[PDB]
Design a protein around this ligand. Structure first.
Ligand SMILES: CCCCCCCCCCCCCC(=O)OC[C@H](COP(=O)(O)OCC(O)COP(=O)(O)OC[C@@H](COC(=O)CCCCCCCCCCCCC)OC(=O)CCCCCCCCCCCCC)OC(=O)CCCCCCCCCCCCC
Ligand code: BCL
Ligand code: BCL
Ligand SMILES: COC(C)(C)C/C=C/C(C)=C/C=C/C(C=O)=C/C=C/C(C)=C/C=C/C=C(C)/C=C/C=C(\C)CC/C=C(C)/C=C/C=C(\C)C(=O)O
Ligand SMILES: COC(C)(C)C/C=C/C(C)=C/C=C/C(C=O)=C/C=C/C(C)=C/C=C/C=C(C)/C=C/C=C(\C)CC/C=C(C)/C=C/C=C(\C)C(=O)O
Ligand SMILES: COC(C)(C)C/C=C/C(C)=C/C=C/C(C=O)=C/C=C/C(C)=C/C=C/C=C(C)/C=C/C=C(\C)CC/C=C(C)/C=C/C=C(\C)C(=O)O
Ligand SMILES: COC(C)(C)C/C=C/C(C)=C/C=C/C(C=O)=C/C=C/C(C)=C/C=C/C=C(C)/C=C/C=C(\C)CC/C=C(C)/C=C/C=C(\C)C(=O)O
Ligand SMILES: COC(C)(C)C/C=C/C(C)=C/C=C/C(C=O)=C/C=C/C(C)=C/C=C/C=C(C)/C=C/C=C(\C)CC/C=C(C)/C=C/C=C(\C)C(=O)O
Ligand SMILES: COC(C)(C)C/C=C/C(C)=C/C=C/C(C=O)=C/C=C/C(C)=C/C=C/C=C(C)/C=C/C=C(\C)CC/C=C(C)/C=C/C=C(\C)C(=O)O
Ligand SMILES: COC(C)(C)C/C=C/C(C)=C/C=C/C(C=O)=C/C=C/C(C)=C/C=C/C=C(C)/C=C/C=C(\C)CC/C=C(C)/C=C/C=C(\C)C(=O)O
Ligand SMILES: CCCCCCCCCCCCO[C@@H]1O[C@H](CO)[C@@H](O[C@H]2O[C@H](CO)[C@@H](O)[C@H](O)[C@H]2O)[C@H](O)[C@H]1O
Ligand SMILES: CCCCCCCCCCCCO[C@@H]1O[C@H](CO)[C@@H](O[C@H]2O[C@H](CO)[C@@H](O)[C@H](O)[C@H]2O)[C@H](O)[C@H]1O
Ligand SMILES: CCCCCCCCCCCCO[C@@H]1O[C@H](CO)[C@@H](O[C@H]2O[C@H](CO)[C@@H](O)[C@H](O)[C@H]2O)[C@H](O)[C@H]1O
Lengths: 48, 174, 39, 71, 273, 60, 39, 56, 39, 49, 49, 39, 40, 58, 48, 55, 40, 39, 49, 39, 39, 40
């Protein structure tokens, strides 16, 4: 499978992968916070 | 051929195509009024209107401005074409009509109408060379010649101006 | 441009990093499931 | 990063920079001076609790309208 | 047909878009790619104008009136009978006027001329675009454009002026008028001087540059020169249209009171407040 | 019949024809879209018994 | 320019292209007439 | 049929075609966007039976 | 200009481009029809 | 019958066929979902009361 | 009868015949769906009461 | 364009495809008639 | 460019195979759909 | 497909494309910001069932 | 069938396929979330 | 990236900086003109007190 | 220009292997999804 | 002008950039659709 | 794995890492102060009645 | 004028500056969000 | 023209002057916030 | 320019060392935070 990387640049590849992971993770967290009611239960626990 | 051009095709509105070198033949934007009177333009008192400035000591550069005589002329391909030897002045409405350039390669002096020249910073600073955007330094060698070098006919004025006018279309043509 | 022998070494780390990332995420999901199961 | 000055003429950059900062400073001061809350020449001595605040909403009587009826 | 000197000049080249494909003439007219787009927009726009006349109350040339939409439609395209037709014609007009300027640039390039004529005409396009695009957009409705009708657009000009109670007091309008009036004087002056040296009284030699320079100096107290009078005429005529564009775009988007009370700043200068 | 293409350049008759058809097609659509009966974007789903029909005023 | 042969060849495409276009328009009118007749 | 590209240099035709389609597409969208039935930015979520009809 | 061989090569892409565009538009219309028919 | 392909680039053919199939399949599904009342019964099965 | 095909390119022939058939078939089906009350009877079979 | 020999081969397939199409259409109509007769 | 008669001859073999495979899969799909919700 | 870049200077096309997309993006944002339903700077915090809807058929 | 890939660039293929899969999968999930009433039942489980 | 060989960085830098400045000013003045984000007058309001458009 | 027949041959075997792997993983996804919420 | 090999590699970056942008835009539509769907 | 740094400038790496860390840390604190009710409980502990 | 080595080193700081700007903007947005959310 | 010898010294003045200005502005905002805060 | 493998090998060792140091400090921070206000 390695020869797929031939003619690519490792610093482009890691920039593309890194930007995808950052985007995907952030999207997944804001989504998950909406469904799971967390940190909303955390906020309510210590709210005055 | 004696014909300077032929039609592109047989349809009514079609363009013409030059046979030879259009800058030299005078076709398209390089053409001139070929019927124009071959005599000098005259002042109200009947003297020749356009003359080299050495021929009339009444004329001088305005004391703030650079005298261009001596400066190098830079053609469209960024080569030196020559240096300014003399200025020609209009004696009816006092202005510089033509610069006169001694060619750097070869020996001939040719006229160069102002308004085809420009200063590197449009006069504001750094006035140490002249730019001729319209023609290459090789094409300077074929600029039409005045039959005397103290006087210019209306026909010669047209031919010279037409040669530089053609340059933007034809200077880099194959 | 990356060459074939470089691509082997790049691929070796790339696979290793991917597997490490997946393993960490798998533990994260196991924890999340035990905390708040979603099916 | 100093090679940026090989690209851009330092003598000219200073004139451009000061000109930008002077315009921006004047724009922000005149925006603030035109506001209610920061019209400091007339009201600068008011305490922070006494300075104007924009409304949480405007209000009206049901028959009043700010604009004439049209189409 | 061709002028007796013309054939020499009809070369290929100087086009902007179409290459050699449209680089031909039709009678006197040069075509080119923007000739094709011109005639398209001219034909579409004119036939939609004729349709607007047909669905209107009369065929009387003076009374035809294709009006813009009501202001309630905002920046949307209204129903065609309710003023959407005016909006389509306005797009056709912009296409035609832009195509005309670019076609002129191709003609000037083919003749080895400077681009002065296309750019001068740009001053007129700017004023039109201000009236039907920029000012309506800043006011937030296409319905602020003027109606297409030989006298109905004069009713619009009338009512827009009186929206500001006394439009003569608009300071940019005063400048624009001064340019228009000075232009017309300058045109009469330059036209007369050229004609009177080239047509002296019977039995008199043809005049000279020196004579028109002498006379012009007696008229204004300075000599403008041959290039200077053409620079002046271009400056005055185009400056008139640019100041016209300014005077209408400030009316409404930027000033909304009567124009007389704009002058309150002058009465309140601190040297005499 | 083909000698028409010796009289006129086909490359620019074809441009003139395509342009003419484009203008005519757009004109007819805008005319119909201006009408009430054929305002098809707003009323195209009406059946022919519900479609508008224009009449003159009753001459009572 | 072009020969009679080239003219005759072009004319064949032009005639068939015109008639093809007129056929497509004929079917469009048949559909329009079935949806909402104008007479 | 390919000979149309000998009459018309295709590099130009693509640019004219793309331009024409771009303007045409925009005009159709703006016509629809400000109709009553198809002003989808405001009413796109209405079901087909709830959507306006231009009955006289 | 281009040769007739180049014209035949270019014309192949122009067909598939046009076909792909017509395909996408056909789906777009049937989606629009399914959502809010115009007849 | 295979001689039909001789003028043709195989990617041009696969592009045309691939485009056609995607168009037809999507039209057929959008149509079928309207006629068969599915996924509407699926959505009704799991909808919240 | 074959001689009618002389001086024609078979791919434009098939492209024309193919375009005709796609047109004719779609016209005929959409017409037929109006006259035969199908798939409207299909939809009524499975529609939610 | 096609020669007389090419036309001969093309015609043989064009005839066969047409006959196959008509045969399939005949079955389709026979089924449609059995399902919902239209006269 | 294009295809030689040899290339076309084997390209056709794959085309026939792909077409028949596709129609077979579609046939199963229709049998299932008919058994689920028949339409005539 | 790449021979399209033999037909056109890519250094021009990229300027033309970025210009087109920038204008298109700006127009679409303005169209939405001018709407009632998607005037998100004033009303973006409303829930989807709270957001405006244009008029139904009578 | 492998001969179909001749004259192609591997990365253009993997770009096209990768983008198709992203688009298709996003469409499928948005559709499936609507039909299956999930994560809506998940959100209802933990909401307060 | 080799993109800086196509386009003069000495030009793109100025064009980018000018674009960002125009965009940034437009967004600030759009927000300053809004009701909800007219921060110079109403910035001290809490998020539950700040204006909201009609439901 | 572009891949040779050598490259295409081994590329194809990978392309097929990847696609098969995807179909396997998606099959498990559907088996679990059907166990969770049947849709017919 | 352009060499063919330069055009080929540019085409690869150009396609990859185009499809990358479309992927980012498709995620933006997923987020917008979840916030406030338009159908 | 150190070969990932090949041909990079460490000042660029430390600038990139440093700016990232400042961004992440500030965001995490601004977020945490909302959820945990701190410093809000600190302020309430010393506020004047 | 330009060189590949100038392009490389220019790209380095350009990417660095872009990240730095995007970091600051991200903090500014999350401050603004915490003060007055827009969704 | 500009030299590396000029440029590195000039960068020292620019950066220090910029940071000095930003520090003075920071104190001005400290004073303004103390007098009439805007959030 | 940019780092040669010997330079990268020094740089990597310090970078790993700093990352470990940072993560260690942050681990203590979270242990304290958890003991103060548990968030699950
Ligand atoms: C006449 C007896 C009665 C008299 C009493 C009433 C009318 C008094 C005015 C009489 C003026 C002369 C009329 C005439 O026959 O002209 C022939 C000549 C053409 O050039 P030429 O040199 O003379 O001939 C050469 C040509 O014969 C052979 O060459 P070729 O074969 O290549 O030429 C093709 C031909 C075909 O000929 C035509 O098509 C004639 C078209 C005449 C159109 C006139 C329309 C007027 C009504 C418009 C109503 C509006 C329709 C929308 O030539 C051409 O291609 C035509 C070139 C001229 C294009 C003119 C474009 C419009 C001009 C302005 C229109 C008025 C705008 C208010 O065309 C022109 O010169 C027309 C333009 C000159 C007048 C411009 C005046 C503008 C005044 C504006 C101020 C108004 C203030 C209220
Ligand atoms: C490739 C060379 C020829 C060509 C050769 C063939 C061949 C060979 C066949 C057809 C057949 C058909 N063609 Mg044709 N066809 C061409 C161009 C077209 C175009 C077009 C606008 O370009 C259209 C609309 C059509 C239309 C049609 C249909 C009437 C019909 C069904 C297949 C299909 O998918 O059609 C819609 C097609 C398109 C929208 C685009 C073109 C798709 C590609 C180029 C052709 C697909 C053929 C397919 C693989 C055949 C499978 C059958 C097995 C080989 C046994 N053809 C080109 C110019 N055509 C088939 C038929 O009627 O069989 C009885 C058939 O076998
Ligand atoms: C480098 C040459 C190729 C490339 C080669 C590969 C390889 C090799 C693989 C993928 C895989 C995938 N690629 Mg791809 N891919 C490219 C361009 C793209 C583009 C695009 C806009 O151009 C997109 C949307 C995708 C999308 C995808 C996904 C369908 C999938 C992984 C998730 C993902 O999106 O990661 C985000 C990706 C991007 C935003 C762009 C590409 C960035 C790098 C190349 C992704 C590497 C993923 C992963 C680390 C590889 C692990 C290998 C295994 C351990 C053996 N690729 C470039 C042009 N792609 C994987 C797959 O098939 O999983 C099922 C896979 O193994
Ligand atoms: C909520 O609703 C919706 C959103 C719809 C729900 C659905 C969401 C969906 C569908 C999500 C899908 C996600 C997905 C799909 O695949 C996600 C895929 C994720 C992936 C692939 C993650 C991979 C991570 C890999 C990492 C971290 C590797 C790091 C490697 C490192 C650090 C070592 C590098 C070493 C080098 C470089 C040395 C070079 C040496 C060289 C060169 C030498 O020496 O020469
Ligand atoms: C409101 O209601 C109002 C509007 C008022 C009511 C009134 C309406 C009125 C008045 C309407 C009038 C309409 C009209 C009047 O005539 C309409 C006339 C229309 C006509 C004629 C249309 C013709 C169309 C022709 C077409 C499409 C041809 C296409 C040709 C093609 C594709 C082939 C090109 C050549 C090739 C490929 C060969 C190259 C090979 C070469 C070179 C080689 O081999 O060498
Ligand atoms: C309000 O309602 C109103 C509006 C009033 C109602 C009325 C509306 C009307 C009248 C509408 C008319 C519509 C119309 C009429 O014709 C519409 C016609 C539309 C058409 C034709 C669309 C065609 C699109 C074709 C496309 C996109 C082609 C793309 C090609 C591509 C991608 C490949 C390029 C080539 C390559 C890459 C190879 C290079 C190789 C080379 C160089 C080599 O190898 O050498
Ligand atoms: C609802 O109302 C309405 C809509 C009205 C109802 C009516 C609908 C109607 C009328 C529908 C009609 C449908 C239809 C009619 O024909 C549908 C026709 C469908 C067809 C044709 C399907 C064919 C599919 C073929 C496929 C998938 C082929 C795949 C090939 C593969 C995998 C091989 C790849 C390898 C190759 C090539 C080798 C390269 C080697 C090389 C190069 C070498 O070795 O050199
Ligand atoms: C909801 O309503 C509606 C929407 C209507 C419902 C209907 C939906 C429909 C109809 C869906 C259809 C979906 C579909 C098809 O039909 C979907 C098709 C899906 C497919 C095909 C997926 C394929 C995935 C393949 C993968 C992941 C392969 C990865 C390969 C890898 C990782 C190896 C990389 C290395 C290589 C290659 C070696 C290089 C060597 C080199 C360079 C060398 O050796 O030199
Ligand atoms: C109404 O509210 C709205 C407007 C709507 C809200 C929005 C506002 C917005 C968007 C604002 C944006 C602001 C902004 C964004 O970046 C602002 C950016 C500001 C910046 C960059 C400031 C930089 C200042 C730098 C200075 C002062 C440098 C001074 C240097 C000195 C002193 C050195 C002199 C030494 C010399 C010369 C010797 C040289 C060597 C020699 C001679 C030798 O060596 O010989
Ligand atoms: C609340 O809701 C949401 C926000 C959604 C919740 C979710 C949040 C998420 C997803 C967070 C994820 C965070 C994360 C993920 O990875 C965070 C990752 C953090 C990381 C990587 C931290 C790393 C720190 C490393 C440091 C400090 C290194 C220091 C190095 C030093 C000191 C030495 C430098 C080098 C030297 C000295 C050698 C020079 C030699 C030279 C030059 C030579 O030898 O030449
Ligand atoms: C592009 C033309 C319009 C096509 C529109 C599609 C629908 C109409 C059916 C087209 C069917 C084929 O149509 C037919 O094509 C052939 C070539 O193949 C043309 O043939 C033309 O060129 C050939 C050589 O190429 C000449 O020998 C012939 O004298 C000339 O007529 C015919 O003039 C046209 O009638
Ligand atoms: C192409 C690249 C990807 C672009 C991404 C954007 C695609 C746009 C959306 C396409 C799919 C829409 O899919 C559709 O989502 C809506 C969202 O209300 C669902 O709608 C339904 O379920 C949701 C969630 O339970 C309810 O809140 C809603 O009231 C109900 O109508 C539909 O059941 C589903 O069919
Ligand atoms: C396009 C890069 C910038 C925007 C990226 C958007 C996100 C997607 C990133 C995918 C990863 C990068 O994928 C990029 O793909 C192209 C073509 O597909 C690869 O390939 C390209 O460049 C190489 C090297 O000059 C050539 O040999 C090749 O023919 C050409 O296609 C690049 O080497 C790789 O960098």
């Amino acid at each position: 499978m390695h020869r797929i990387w031939m003619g690519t640049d490792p610093h482009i590849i890691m920039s593309a992968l890194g930007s995808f992971l950052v985007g995907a993770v952030l999207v997944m967290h804001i989504w998950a916070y909406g469904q799971f009611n967390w940190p909303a239960t955390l906020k309510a626990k210590y709210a005055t | 051929s004696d014909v300077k051009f032929v039609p592109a095709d047989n349809y009514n509105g079609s363009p013409i195509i030059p046979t030879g070198n259009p800058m030299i033949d005078g076709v398209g934007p390089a053409s001139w009024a070929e019927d124009r009177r071959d005599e000098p333009d005259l002042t109200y008192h009947g003297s020749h209107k356009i003359v080299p400035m050495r021929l009339d000591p009444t004329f001088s550069i305005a004391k703030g401005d650079p005298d261009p005589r001596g400066l190098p002329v830079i053609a469209a391909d960024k080569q030196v074409a020559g240096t300014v030897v003399e200025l020609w002045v209009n004696r009816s409405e006092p202005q510089v009509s033509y610069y006169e350039v001694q060619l750097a390669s070869g020996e001939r002096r040719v006229l160069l109408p102002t308004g085809y020249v420009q200063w590197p910073n449009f006069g504001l600073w750094g006035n140490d060379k002249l730019l001729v955007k319209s023609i290459t330094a090789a094409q300077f060698a074929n600029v039409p010649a005045t039959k005397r070098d103290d006087q210019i006919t209306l026909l010669e004025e047209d031919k010279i101006c037409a040669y530089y006018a053609g340059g933007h279309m034809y200077a880099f043509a194959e | 441009g990356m060459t074939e022998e470089e691509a082997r070494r790049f691929h070796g780390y790339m696979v290793t990093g991917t597997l490490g990332y997946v393993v960490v995420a798998s533990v994260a999901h196991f924890l999340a499931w035990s905390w708040r199961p979603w099916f | 990063m100093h090679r940026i000055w090989l690209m851009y003429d330092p003598r000219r950059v200073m004139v451009a920079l000061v000109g930008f900062l002077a315009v921006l400073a004047l724009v922000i001061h005149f925006v603030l001076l035109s506001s209610q809350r920061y019209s400091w020449i007339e009201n600068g001595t008011l305490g922070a609790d006494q300075a104007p605040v924009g409304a949480s909403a405007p209000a009206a009587a049901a028959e009043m309208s700010p604009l004439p009826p049209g189409r | 047909a061709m002028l007796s000197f013309e054939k020499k000049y009809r070369v290929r080249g100087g086009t902007l878009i179409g290459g050699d494909l449209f680089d031909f003439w039709f009678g006197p007219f040069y075509v080119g790619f923007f000739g094709v787009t011109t005639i398209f927009f001219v034909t579409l726009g004119t036939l939609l104008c004729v349709w607007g006349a047909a669905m209107g109350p009369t065929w009387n040339l003076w009374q035809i009136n294709i009006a813009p939409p009501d202001l309630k439609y905002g920046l949307g395209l209204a129903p065609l009978r309710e003023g959407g037709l005016w909006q389509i014609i306005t797009l056709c007009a912009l296409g035609a006027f832009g195509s005309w300027a670019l076609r002129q640039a191709e003609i000037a390039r083919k003749l080895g001329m400077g681009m002065h004529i296309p750019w001068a005409y740009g001053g007129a396009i700017l004023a039109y675009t201000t009236l039907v695009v920029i000012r309506p957009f800043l006011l937030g409705a296409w319905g602020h454009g003027f109606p297409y009708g030989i006298f109905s657009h004069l009713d619009w000009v009338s009512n827009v002026g009186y929206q500001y109670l006394h439009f003569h007091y608009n300071p940019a309008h005063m400048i624009a008028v001064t340019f228009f009036f000075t232009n017309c004087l300058a045109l009469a002056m330059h036209g007369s001087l050229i004609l009177s040296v080239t047509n002296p009284p019977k039995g008199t030699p043809t005049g000279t540059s020196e004579q028109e320079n002498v006379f012009f100096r007696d008229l204004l107290g300075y000599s403008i020169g041959a290039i200077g009078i053409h620079r002046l005429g271009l400056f005055l005529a185009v400056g008139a249209a640019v100041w016209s564009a300014i005077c209408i775009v400030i009316s409404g988007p930027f000033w909304t009171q009567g124009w007389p009370e704009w002058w309150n700043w002058w009465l309140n200068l601190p040297i005499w407040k």
